[PDB]
């Protein structure tokens, strides 16, 4: 089943991978938060300078530490409120959670690297991530059973992949005009890449999520919808992954010609989406997390 | 349990950008030569090679990755199967390998590893002069000799003292054979007088010791589990009759001391001429890439996980 997570393109890894992974474990220790999160970041942004790769690695660590620590809606609503204050630029006062201080450091370091325009886009993607998490949490407690369409539409935001795609611009040191960033084909390539990354994860993490009574997983949602066996649910999930890869590859050639400079930056951005798709698969296949 | 904090080097490694592509190509090579028996996708032997030869061209890196894979496939038979306890079977196999290293063509019913070694020999012959193949072949011969010596220890239920173990370990780990590949990876030639210089040999010895003793600390659990005692931790524990934690501390102390020796001896390389000293500084950088590669890969490799 795992062997069927395949792409017609290949990834790359930063030569700095291990130095970043060590500095991530050092960073997590400093803020009081096996793992190899730096080796995901090193594959996801393989051309990035060491300074920018380290921010991306520390951000990716934060998301995993967040996902792990959360293991109660009133408590979740309270925490998300303040994270967003930090993201928009509120000082981490006393009695703040370790994660809040860590997020304050990431915002601080990104502010040195990116314009206000970028910080807003990143912040909005993070807000939608929190919203999607609160939605999944309610479903869990209330025992709600979302269909495949609903799960997949929510999964695009619950995985925070869009926040990670925002870092591609900083890694690649590219600027895209509003009209190119928001173009329907660019959005459809981002959606395809996000679905591929999430559905790859779901196929690899379903055993983990079954054990902990979580059903927010494509294989588990497909199983419930079709009233079918686990092997058929896995087969259906990998068919959707295969179809989404075909869709990404096809739409790559549908990007309009704006001008030389804009299309150069767009080619780098889409190459960045491919690096992230391969990074997710290459990293997850080896990761202790899904063993 | 975590020894990262006690395996520190004052130099850093690097990894080839093609690390994952190289590992996938190694699995295909392994499959092609029928070396995969029974989690092939978590071996990650390409990810060690990618770190050990980080600046190598994809073709030379692929030979290095397949060679490192070959050593692990071979090693697992010796260190976990009956051939490692049968000197007469080991002598028979080594005679076939040695024939192949000299350039003999594999017979129809030579074992998978013999066919695989012949492929590596052919590919190295395309990339290396005859003098190199002789140096490589001799280091591999000493590896076989050291493994037969380990086999006799397993057979007799013997444990060597620290001095004897460490002296044998420099050959049983095949690190010198892997060091030979640095020359091809970095596309350098050293003249005989530079290659054999006392200080160059002492730097290779220290680098080899560091790699083996780092491995011994990280691999003592899986080796205890198979009843193997060819491990600095287990030999120290045998000699001093001390606790396992004391043995580990003593092993990590020797590792630290060897790192210090390597770093200080770096500055003792004589000036021969511009060309040779540029090639030697490239080579010594190569030893540092290997030292880091060994630790960086081993800390996260499934091979050394409980
Ligand atoms: C954890 C996180 C939000 C992001 C890490 C970085 C990243 C975008 C990785 C891709 C894998 C997938 C989208 C994780 C989603 O969280 P999920 O809870 O499905 O991850 P898990 O299967 O590892 O528990
Ligand atoms: C397998 C082999 C001879 C070499 C692979 C490449 C290499 C030079 C690796 C460095 C670590 C160490 C020398 C492994 C061999 O010893 P050992 O048998 O203790 O390896 P293990 O602890 O991984 O089983
Ligand atoms: Mg998951
Ligand atoms: Mg989860
Ligand atoms: Mg072994
Ligand atoms: Mg060992």
Curated annotation (Swiss-Prot), chain B:
Q: Which Enzyme Commission numbers does its entry carry?
A: 4.2.3.98
Instruction: Copy the pathway line from the protein's UniProt record.
Output: Secondary metabolite biosynthesis; terpenoid biosynthesis
Hey, where's the site called Plays a critical role for abstraction of the pyrophosphate group on this chain? 173
- List cofactor names only: Mg(2+)
Q: Which reaction does it catalyse?
A: (2E,6E)-farnesyl diphosphate + H2O = (+)-T-muurolol + diphosphate
Does this UniProt record's set of keywords contain Magnesium?
A: yes
Motif DDXXD motif per UniProt: ranges: 75-79
What is the uppermost EC class here? Answer: lyase
The positions annotated for binding substrate are 169, 222, 303-304
User: Where does the record place the site Plays a critical role in the stabilization of intermediate cation?
Assistant: 72
Annotated Mg(2+) 3 binding sites: 215, 219, 223
Keywords of the record: Lyase, Magnesium, Metal-binding
Q: Which family does it belong to?
A: Belongs to the terpene synthase family.
About its domains, the entry says: The Asp-Asp-Xaa-Xaa-Asp (DDXXD) motif is important for the catalytic activity, presumably through binding to Mg(2+).
Q: Quote the protein name from its UniProt record.
A: (+)-T-muurolol synthase ((2E,6E)-farnesyl diphosphate cyclizing)
């Amino acid at each position: 089943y795992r062997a069927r997570l395949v792409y017609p393109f290949s990834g790359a890894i930063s030569p700095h991978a291990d130095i970043v992974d060590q500095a991530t474990l050092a960073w997590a220790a400093m803020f009081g938060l096996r793992l190899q999160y730096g080796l995901l970041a090193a594959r996801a942004y393989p051309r990035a300078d060491r300074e920018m790769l380290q921010i991306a690695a520390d951000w990716i660590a934060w998301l995993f530490f967040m996902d792990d620590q959360c293991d109660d809606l009133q408590r979740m609503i309270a925490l998300h409120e303040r994270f967003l204050a930090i993201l928009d630029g509120a000082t981490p006062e006393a009695h703040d959670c370790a994660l809040t201080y860590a997020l304050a450091d990431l915002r601080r370091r990104l502010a040195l690297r990116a314009p206000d325009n970028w910080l807003r886009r990143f912040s909005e993607h993070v807000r939608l991530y929190f919203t999607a998490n609160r939605w999944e949490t309610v479903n869990r407690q209330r025992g709600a059973t979302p269909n495949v369409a609903t799960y997949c539409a929510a999964r695009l935001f619950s995985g925070a992949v869009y926040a990670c795609f925002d870092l591609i611009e900083l890694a690649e040191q590219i600027e895209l005009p509003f009209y190119a960033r928001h173009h329907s084909i660019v959005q459809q390539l981002e959606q395809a890449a996000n679905n591929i990354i999430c559905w790859c994860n779901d196929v690899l993490s379903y055993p983990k999520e079954m054990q902990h009574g979580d059903r927010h997983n494509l294989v588990l949602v497909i199983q419930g919808e079709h009233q079918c066996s686990l092997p058929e649910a896995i087969d259906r999930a990998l068919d959707l992954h295969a179809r989404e890869v075909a869709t990404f590859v096809r739409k790559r050639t549908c990007v309009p010609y704006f001008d030389a400079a804009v299309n150069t930056a767009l080619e780098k951005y889409v190459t960045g989406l491919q690096f992230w798709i391969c990074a997710n698969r290459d990293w997850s296949l080896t990761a202790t997390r899904y063993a």
